[PDB]
């Protein structure tokens, strides 16, 4: 019961019932605003359609049709009536806003008969017929009987045979003929299924199509790419239709109370006169700045602005709105907090704080932290930009300096590799089916839409760069080439940006606004977790500290053994057969390594750094090419055979679970003795030459048993205690462990007896909990997402149900034995907002990620506290 | 406080304080028997010596010396007194009996001076001096200043220069000279440390040496090999010395109330007249059957038998005793429940039941279940034995038909591989330092001791075959050859058995006594767990059912794809690029595989069989030799290149965690469809042709997520439902999963939504919990045991603290969602007594192991219930 809600029968609170769009339509209805009345079929009904075999049940059909009767009775027309039909728009609404992804069908309820009854009742044949040519196209697209390709090929050639330039110029005749051509395209590109004439079948098929669409491969990739769970489901709103294609005094448009690209306060957006928004603003026929609407219809612009201001004040955030002007009567068909660009979100957050609309708290909890990745994206080198060959210019849809090769299909944009082969997507317009290539491209180059176009919208959503509405790009896919200015490209290199310019460019790195600093500042005042970085280089350390890192949660020591001028010593060691000989090979590294640590301790200035002992199996240091092995044998007095056999003997079946990490230090404690010396000697020295105290954090990797840790710990403590011969050295130091093995977590109360701190290496922990190597997992992981087996990538987003439990039991149990035990997470999960909230809630002390994710973790840790207190 | 207990101040109950030997000496003291009074230094004091830096503390020293004063005062002599010294025997006692491993020093408290005071007080110079030559040797051995090699080279050449054949023939002079030679060997094979003259230093050094010995590499390997934990510690008993080397009316010996080789009721054992047991019965000078003692000293044999009978009746189990006759006065210096051979343990268990001494329950809980492995050991082929070239004969120390190559060092016996390269250890006598080679050998061939010898004793302990006391084996290690009859062997092949005969032999398999059946019968009446086997072959099934298997807990389906006449279809499939093409390759296997299942269902006759879906990565089916790959390409129309590249593309870094198990069925559900058909069609048919009902158990391997299982389950159910077209088939079937991934266990309440049964694959579960591949782990695992990091092999013995928790949470959580969920363990752990008790206690329903471990699991499941109710 209650599968359907009238707008007035709702509120903004029931967003999961009514979806984003739904509770907003409801809210506004409540606000007493000019919105066409209507009803929402709940997200519940989506779950019902699905978890019930995929059939709109009796109670749903009836509950829908019921509301239809309400509407008729309401606005005195009969649903799909012959003389005066009641037309509706059907548009899907997820609990979460998904701009550029949802479905909208307008003018629903028109048949071969009602289009004439509507024409006579209205007295405007071109109108009724345009609204029919439009409804046939949308239903065939959204309910998916056939694609826009077919449809526009017809509306287009007609314009080009009939000497007409704008479909706005076709006549009541052309349009009605065209309806026939389109209804041909339908039946003729299918079974021979007559285009639903029955308004009621049209409605139900719309409803089904919308529920069905929720499991479309594209919805799934977007949902994963946006952390949206498929437990949600889409609501479907049905509203009484309002028309902007009624004539010269009608129109429609998309407006945003603040620039969604920049954050600049003031109306931003576009419109088209005598057009339906839901398809002709979001595309062709160059739309006009919503500011020009003051010129055309000052009566409406004034009523619109005030209503837009009232919506912003009401939802206390920038509103992305869709309105329609029905012959000088303005209607709002939709609001939603605009989806912004990161610089935008920051800018809007500061302004509302200064403007007194929102508090710092709301400002923090409001930025999608994951989007901060944009702010640290390479900008263009200005001098490379000065000498830049500007082949063109267009609309600055979403900010960014993007440069890369050009490809004409999302598929080939994606197959040239994601955001790694600098791919540039050159399209006319993008569509939901392009979601992956767009998202893989560095920037999008479109040939037609504007700021509210699909490409503008989606790109800004993903922080990708986009120049929309570049009318002069003559594209040829069969040849896969394009014309711009005095040039023709063929999947070659291109460059472009938000300064609108497009050129035939060295990118660098960029400034961080004061809204970034102001936000990060507020972040810091609310977050309780500390944010450390994962940096094994001082350049990275400074970069990380600059962005807010409070220390190093992981300095890997492998580079100190791999580096050319050092690898030979560990190779010497590996092929040595005598502890005294390995010790010797090892000792030679002390000066190199101690050297690396001082430079790190100097970069750090007092900030703690968690140093990690040798992690990888020895095999990684041995050469595996016989050229290189023949070089080594020579610099050792060995025969290629004995080196080749030494290497072979180190080889393992499962390198992720072999002789490595602490295991090597148990068989070769000399590695650990040598590392503790390099570390301890380094620290004491920088402590000497600077007076700044250092409390080294030594982390033994891959521990599964308390006795296994204690063993290596002993060797660490003894050497550390011995090194304190630069004075019996007052220096404190903490010996901790990487919990990256389930046993470590299971027996964390025993491991804590010997470990002063726990650093969760969730990447590897995930790998053992799940049973798969990140490396080999890609060969089946896509199928898993495709099958909805996994909604999130376990390697990017912490699996809280499984791996999350091990982390949470390690903390609780470790703290039974060591109440004051520090715990920090390490890895990709450290820079993931949801992994960070879990960690905040589970009690970790700090988080640690790459230097570029520190701002994300800083923001996420503040949202975690604010969301949790 | 209370680091020392008098014998009377103890009881059999405080066995962990007083050790096996201690509480037994106490018990007997209590029984009012003829044992030299004395005191025990607790196992606690061992823990104290250790966990306190390895120093016998003040409170220990004093508590010991105190009891020494007690003894003096007690048996009116003064400890290490000059004229009448008080001599003591120092012998270590673990909580657990470890025959052949502990330390004993006799005649302790004699110095260069007291040996004469003892000689005058005693009036027997040869006695005092023999007891000194003996004390110098034992202290140097046990307290380890130098080895028996040195010592006997002296006592021996003396006998062979002085025309004396038995050291029993040396005189008061020879012996005293010899003491000098030995005390030379000491100081002269060390620093120049004078042999402790101070009785009190002798005692303390004995005590320390015994505590210290507890961590000796050999104690550790034996402790692991016998599941003894190093948390235990050894107690050290100090008793007033009684002498069997006093003369012609004195002697000593080791007797067992029942044959420990066979179980036959009646005294078994040996003695030597005018000798100290603690070193001259357990070795050279051919000892006499303890039955001949009726001839020599009928007065003593009669008192001895009655006392032996009373000890057996008292401890209600066969007693292994050491007694000494001090000039016609008999003393008991020790009892302990004899360690028996498996056939023995069985035989003694039945007899005590029939004899009315013990109940069935006690009989079951008494057999060391792990020892049942002996009963199913290949016996000799009798006809190969008839035509056997008997190069010799000796004592049937422990039963068995052993055959193998001969090696003269434990090290080389072990390096020729354990019980896998049929190694035969040919020694004069074995020693604690030979523990690993003995244990690796198929049988032991000794040149001197008897039934109570080290080799006899240790071997029977481990169920290894042993022929002791083969006086004619002339051994030459420098040449590594040996003479027997008319032959000389050089690490060649040899064969031997408990029929005593030794020959220059095809072994087969053997009968199982009725005491085995009677025990197994009692087992069944008490055990609640069911015992299934792991068999993928019907030969194995029959063998397993024969031994008591109640079904199959794991039928692996890999052989059905590997077998020559079938591998090409899966290879075809693997190199096919089309679901329809793989399906085809797959379908060809249906007749072969369905064929394998019927034969299994027919062997099983109604017993359930858990069938496991394809487990290994596809790479295992592709050939990796280019000869074989060139063969395949040819039988496919492929170029070696395309096959070679297809194989390369399947290759993984970590094969244990790649694309395998359920993962393959998610990308290739056709594998699972084809397997369900082969299985379901097989079952229905045998159900047809037999009328015996079958309820297939389908097990999906490697599950980590409930949706992942459900996915594959769906495909399984649909095909199973479709196959029921041999009639809509009434056939029931259970879809379950192998919990072998931590996530599976962590999320077991969700996995149970779709799984009807959980089969724990603890081998792989251990591998993921611990972080190591069983394969690559051997390169560091020994070091771990050597370092006491791990006391047990995690792969043979279930780690209850870590892996055990995951099993136990999977059961508790699985049963929250599926109260009636069946749970069984699978693997090596299924046939491990301690893994089986845990499983009984954790609530598993059945256990499953190799067909040869079924009797062990049957017995272990009964001991688990009996130990648990």
């Amino acid at each position: 019961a209650k599968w359907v809600y009238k707008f007035e029968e709702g509120n903004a609170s029931m967003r999961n019932l009514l979806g984003g769009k739904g509770c907003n339509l409801a809210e506004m209805t409540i606000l007493g605003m000019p919105i066409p009345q209507g009803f929402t079929v709940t997200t519940e009904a989506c779950t019902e359609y699905y978890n019930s075999g995929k059939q709109i049940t009796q109670e749903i059909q009836d509950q829908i049709f019921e509301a239809i009767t309400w509407l008729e009775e309401l606005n005195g027309k009969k649903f799909g009536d012959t003389e005066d039909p009641l037309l509706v728009s059907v548009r899907s609404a997820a609990r979460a806003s998904m701009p550029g992804m949802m479905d909208t069908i307008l003018n629903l309820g028109l048949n071969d008969v009602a289009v004439e009854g509507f024409a006579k009742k209205t007295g405007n044949p071109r109108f009724a017929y345009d609204s029919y040519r439009r409804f046939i196209q949308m239903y065939s697209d959204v309910v998916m009987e056939v694609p826009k390709s077919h449809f526009e090929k017809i509306i287009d050639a007609m314009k080009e045979e009939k000497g007409v330039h704008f479909d706005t110029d076709l006549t009541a005749d052309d349009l009605k003929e065209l309806a026939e051509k389109f209804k041909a395209v339908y039946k003729e590109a299918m079974n021979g299924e007559e285009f639903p004439q029955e308004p009621k079948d049209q409605l139900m098929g719309a409803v089904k199509a919308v529920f069905r669409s929720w499991d479309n491969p594209r919805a799934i990739v977007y949902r994963r790419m946006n952390d949206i769970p498929g437990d949600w489901g889409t609501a479907v709103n049905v509203q009484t239709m309002v028309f902007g294609n009624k004539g010269e005094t009608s129109g429609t448009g998309v407006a945003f109370t603040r620039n969604p690209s920049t954050g600049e306060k003031g109306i931003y957006g576009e419109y088209l006169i005598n057009a339906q928004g839901e398809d002709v603003v979001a595309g062709v026929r160059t739309p006009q700045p919503i500011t020009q609407l003051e010129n055309d219809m000052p009566d409406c612009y004034k009523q619109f602005m005030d209503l837009a201001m009232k919506l912003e004040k009401h939802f206390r955030d920038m509103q992305d709105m869709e309105f329609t002007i029905e012959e000088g009567k303005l209607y709002f068909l939709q609001t939603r907090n605009g989806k912004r660009t990161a610089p935008a979100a920051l800018q809007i957050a500061c302004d509302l704080v200064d403007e007194g609309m929102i508090t710092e708290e709301e400002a923090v909890v409001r930025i999608e932290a994951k989007s901060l990745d944009q702010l640290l994206h390479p900008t263009f080198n200005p001098a490379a930009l000065k000498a830049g060959e500007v082949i063109g210019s267009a609309l600055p849809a979403s900010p960014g300096a993007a440069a890369g090769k050009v490809y004409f299909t999302a598929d080939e944009a994606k197959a040239a590799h994601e955001k790694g082969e600098r791919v540039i997507l050159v399209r006319l317009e993008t569509s939901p089916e392009d979601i992956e290539g767009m998202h893989a491209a560095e920037g999008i180059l479109t040939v037609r839409g504007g700021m509210t176009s699909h490409a503008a919208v989606v790109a800004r959503g993903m922080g990708t760069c986009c120049v929309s509405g570049c009318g002069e790009i003559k594209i040829n896919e069969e040849a896969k080439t394009f014309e711009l200015g005095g040039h023709t490209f063929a999947e070659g290199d291109y460059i472009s940006l938000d300064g609108s310019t497009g050129k035939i460019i060295e990118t660098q790195e960029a400034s961080v606004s004061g809204s970034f600093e102001r936000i990060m500042v507020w972040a810091d005042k609310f977050r309780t977790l500390k944010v450390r970085t994962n940096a094994d280089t001082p350049e990275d350390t400074l970069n990380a500290v600059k962005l807010g890192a409070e220390g190093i949660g992981l300095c890997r020591t492998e580079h100190m053994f791999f580096e050319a001028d050092r690898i030979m010593k560990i190779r010497k060691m590996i092929l040595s057969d005598s502890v005294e000989a390995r010790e010797e090979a090892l000792n030679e590294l002390i000066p190199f390594q101690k050297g690396d640590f001082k430079a790190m301790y100097k970069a750090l200035e007092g900030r703690p750094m968690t140093v990690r002992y040798l992690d990888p199996p020895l095999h990684e240091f041995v050469p595996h090419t016989e050229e290189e092995q023949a070089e080594l044998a020579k610099n050792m007095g060995l025969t290629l055979a004995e080196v080749k056999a030494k290497v072979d003997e180190l080889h393992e079946f499962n390198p992720m679970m072999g002789h490595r990490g602490c295991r090597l230090a148990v068989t070769y404690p000399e590695i650990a003795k040598m590392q503790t010396r390099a570390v301890m000697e380094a620290a004491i020295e920088v402590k000497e030459e600077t007076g700044i105290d250092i409390v080294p954090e030594i982390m033994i990797p891959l521990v599964g048993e308390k006795k296994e840790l204690k063993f290596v710990k002993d060797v660490v403590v003894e050497v550390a205690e011995q090194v304190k011969k630069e004075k019996g050295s007052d220096m404190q130091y903490h010996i901790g462990t990487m919990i990256e093995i389930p046993r470590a977590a299971l027996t964390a109360d025993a491991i804590a007896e010997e470990a002063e701190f726990f650093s969760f290496g969730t990447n590897d922990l995930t790998q053992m909990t799940f049973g798969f190597s990140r490396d080999d997992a890609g060969k089946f992981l896509d199928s898993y997402y495709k099958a909805k087996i996994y909604e999130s990538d376990p390697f990017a987003r912490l699996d809280q149900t499984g791996v999350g439990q091990l982390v949470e039991m390690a903390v609780k149990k470790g703290r039974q034995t060591r109440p004051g035990l520090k715990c920090g997470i390490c890895g990709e999960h450290g820079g993931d907002p949801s992994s960070v909230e879990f960690c905040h809630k589970v009690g970790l002390n700090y988080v640690s990620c790459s230097p570029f994710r520190v701002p994300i973790a800083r923001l996420a840790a503040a949202q975690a506290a604010l969301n949790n207190k």
Side-chain angles (χ1 to χ4, degrees), chain A residues 22-39:
Chain A
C23 51
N24 265 2
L25 279 160
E27 191 57 31
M28 289 193 281
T29 290
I30 270 38
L31 281 149
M33 289 178 82
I35 70 202
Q37 252 320 258
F39 59 88

mmCIF file of all heavy atoms in Angstrom, chain A residues 22-39:
data_model
loop_
_atom_site.group_PDB
_atom_site.id
_atom_site.type_symbol
_atom_site.label_atom_id
_atom_site.label_comp_id
_atom_site.label_asym_id
_atom_site.label_seq_id
_atom_site.Cartn_x
_atom_site.Cartn_y
_atom_site.Cartn_z
ATOM 1 N N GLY A 22 11.760 13.787 -6.510
ATOM 2 C CA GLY A 22 10.453 13.687 -5.901
ATOM 3 C C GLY A 22 10.217 14.551 -4.683
ATOM 4 O O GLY A 22 9.263 15.324 -4.659
ATOM 5 N N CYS A 23 11.000 14.364 -3.624
ATOM 6 C CA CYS A 23 10.838 15.164 -2.392
ATOM 7 C C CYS A 23 11.065 16.637 -2.702
ATOM 8 O O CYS A 23 10.544 17.477 -2.024
ATOM 9 C CB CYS A 23 11.836 14.713 -1.329
ATOM 10 S SG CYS A 23 13.492 14.679 -2.047
ATOM 11 N N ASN A 24 11.855 16.953 -3.710
ATOM 12 C CA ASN A 24 12.054 18.355 -4.086
ATOM 13 C C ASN A 24 10.784 18.922 -4.739
ATOM 14 O O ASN A 24 10.350 20.033 -4.402
ATOM 15 C CB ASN A 24 13.245 18.513 -5.013
ATOM 16 C CG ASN A 24 14.555 18.886 -4.264
ATOM 17 O OD1 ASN A 24 14.579 18.996 -3.044
ATOM 18 N ND2 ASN A 24 15.619 19.119 -5.015
ATOM 19 N N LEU A 25 10.150 18.140 -5.626
ATOM 20 C CA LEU A 25 8.885 18.570 -6.275
ATOM 21 C C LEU A 25 7.834 18.745 -5.190
ATOM 22 O O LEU A 25 7.050 19.682 -5.206
ATOM 23 C CB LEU A 25 8.394 17.521 -7.277
ATOM 24 C CG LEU A 25 9.069 17.561 -8.642
ATOM 25 C CD1 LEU A 25 8.870 16.197 -9.363
ATOM 26 C CD2 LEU A 25 8.538 18.759 -9.453
ATOM 27 N N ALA A 26 7.900 17.870 -4.201
ATOM 28 C CA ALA A 26 6.989 17.871 -3.075
ATOM 29 C C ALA A 26 7.212 19.097 -2.227
ATOM 30 O O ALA A 26 6.290 19.829 -1.867
ATOM 31 C CB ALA A 26 7.235 16.631 -2.261
ATOM 32 N N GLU A 27 8.476 19.298 -1.893
ATOM 33 C CA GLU A 27 8.918 20.404 -1.072
ATOM 34 C C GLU A 27 8.396 21.721 -1.630
ATOM 35 O O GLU A 27 7.799 22.528 -0.908
ATOM 36 C CB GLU A 27 10.446 20.406 -1.027
ATOM 37 C CG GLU A 27 10.983 21.339 -0.004
ATOM 38 C CD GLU A 27 10.450 21.006 1.372
ATOM 39 O OE1 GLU A 27 10.197 19.799 1.625
ATOM 40 O OE2 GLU A 27 10.282 21.943 2.197
ATOM 41 N N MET A 28 8.674 21.925 -2.918
ATOM 42 C CA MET A 28 8.265 23.106 -3.665
ATOM 43 C C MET A 28 6.766 23.214 -3.684
ATOM 44 O O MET A 28 6.239 24.289 -3.525
ATOM 45 C CB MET A 28 8.797 23.049 -5.097
ATOM 46 C CG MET A 28 10.279 23.240 -5.210
ATOM 47 S SD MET A 28 10.664 23.534 -6.911
ATOM 48 C CE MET A 28 10.636 21.932 -7.591
ATOM 49 N N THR A 29 6.075 22.114 -3.908
ATOM 50 C CA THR A 29 4.625 22.140 -3.879
ATOM 51 C C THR A 29 4.245 22.752 -2.545
ATOM 52 O O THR A 29 3.401 23.653 -2.454
ATOM 53 C CB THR A 29 4.079 20.744 -3.898
ATOM 54 O OG1 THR A 29 4.305 20.150 -5.187
ATOM 55 C CG2 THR A 29 2.631 20.745 -3.564
ATOM 56 N N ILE A 30 4.898 22.255 -1.500
ATOM 57 C CA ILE A 30 4.664 22.746 -0.147
ATOM 58 C C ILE A 30 4.989 24.267 -0.024
ATOM 59 O O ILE A 30 4.225 25.054 0.579
ATOM 60 C CB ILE A 30 5.445 21.832 0.852
ATOM 61 C CG1 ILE A 30 4.534 20.674 1.271
ATOM 62 C CG2 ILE A 30 5.980 22.600 2.051
ATOM 63 C CD1 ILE A 30 3.643 20.116 0.144
ATOM 64 N N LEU A 31 6.087 24.674 -0.656
ATOM 65 C CA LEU A 31 6.516 26.061 -0.668
ATOM 66 C C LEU A 31 5.474 26.978 -1.339
ATOM 67 O O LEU A 31 5.593 28.207 -1.259
ATOM 68 C CB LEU A 31 7.845 26.181 -1.419
ATOM 69 C CG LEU A 31 9.149 25.796 -0.730
ATOM 70 C CD1 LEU A 31 10.142 25.273 -1.727
ATOM 71 C CD2 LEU A 31 9.694 27.011 -0.042
ATOM 72 N N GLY A 32 4.461 26.393 -1.996
ATOM 73 C CA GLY A 32 3.440 27.179 -2.682
ATOM 74 C C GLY A 32 3.907 27.739 -4.026
ATOM 75 O O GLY A 32 3.372 28.739 -4.516
ATOM 76 N N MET A 33 4.883 27.074 -4.640
ATOM 77 C CA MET A 33 5.443 27.487 -5.928
ATOM 78 C C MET A 33 4.692 26.952 -7.160
ATOM 79 O O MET A 33 3.982 25.954 -7.069
ATOM 80 C CB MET A 33 6.912 27.086 -6.001
ATOM 81 C CG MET A 33 7.788 27.920 -5.097
ATOM 82 S SD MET A 33 9.462 27.408 -5.169
ATOM 83 C CE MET A 33 9.942 28.221 -6.573
ATOM 84 N N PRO A 34 4.896 27.588 -8.329
ATOM 85 C CA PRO A 34 4.267 27.240 -9.606
ATOM 86 C C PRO A 34 4.771 25.993 -10.335
ATOM 87 O O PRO A 34 5.358 26.092 -11.436
ATOM 88 C CB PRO A 34 4.463 28.510 -10.440
ATOM 89 C CG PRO A 34 5.826 28.960 -9.975
ATOM 90 C CD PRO A 34 5.679 28.830 -8.476
ATOM 91 N N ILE A 35 4.488 24.823 -9.748
ATOM 92 C CA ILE A 35 4.882 23.537 -10.349
ATOM 93 C C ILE A 35 3.654 22.719 -10.792
ATOM 94 O O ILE A 35 2.630 22.678 -10.102
ATOM 95 C CB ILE A 35 5.765 22.666 -9.374
ATOM 96 C CG1 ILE A 35 4.900 22.173 -8.225
ATOM 97 C CG2 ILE A 35 7.045 23.480 -8.839
ATOM 98 C CD1 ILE A 35 5.689 21.806 -7.014
ATOM 99 N N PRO A 36 3.722 22.095 -11.974
ATOM 100 C CA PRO A 36 2.585 21.291 -12.437
ATOM 101 C C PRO A 36 2.406 20.174 -11.418
ATOM 102 O O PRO A 36 3.369 19.504 -11.081
ATOM 103 C CB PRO A 36 3.093 20.697 -13.740
ATOM 104 C CG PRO A 36 4.282 21.535 -14.119
ATOM 105 C CD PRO A 36 4.900 21.933 -12.842
ATOM 106 N N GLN A 37 1.209 20.048 -10.852
ATOM 107 C CA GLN A 37 0.884 19.005 -9.883
ATOM 108 C C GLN A 37 1.198 17.637 -10.461
ATOM 109 O O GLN A 37 1.351 17.481 -11.672
ATOM 110 C CB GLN A 37 -0.593 19.052 -9.508
ATOM 111 C CG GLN A 37 -0.888 19.560 -8.109
ATOM 112 C CD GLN A 37 0.114 19.046 -7.076
ATOM 113 O OE1 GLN A 37 -0.169 18.099 -6.300
ATOM 114 N NE2 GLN A 37 1.305 19.672 -7.059
ATOM 115 N N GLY A 38 1.260 16.623 -9.617
ATOM 116 C CA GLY A 38 1.609 15.312 -10.131
ATOM 117 C C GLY A 38 1.812 14.360 -8.974
ATOM 118 O O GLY A 38 1.548 14.705 -7.810
ATOM 119 N N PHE A 39 2.320 13.174 -9.280
ATOM 120 C CA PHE A 39 2.529 12.160 -8.249
ATOM 121 C C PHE A 39 3.829 11.374 -8.508
ATOM 122 O O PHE A 39 4.294 11.246 -9.656
ATOM 123 C CB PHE A 39 1.326 11.178 -8.229
ATOM 124 C CG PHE A 39 1.114 10.487 -9.538
ATOM 125 C CD1 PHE A 39 1.783 9.292 -9.820
ATOM 126 C CD2 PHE A 39 0.355 11.089 -10.535
ATOM 127 C CE1 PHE A 39 1.710 8.724 -11.073
ATOM 128 C CE2 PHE A 39 0.279 10.529 -11.771
ATOM 129 C CZ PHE A 39 0.957 9.339 -12.057
#
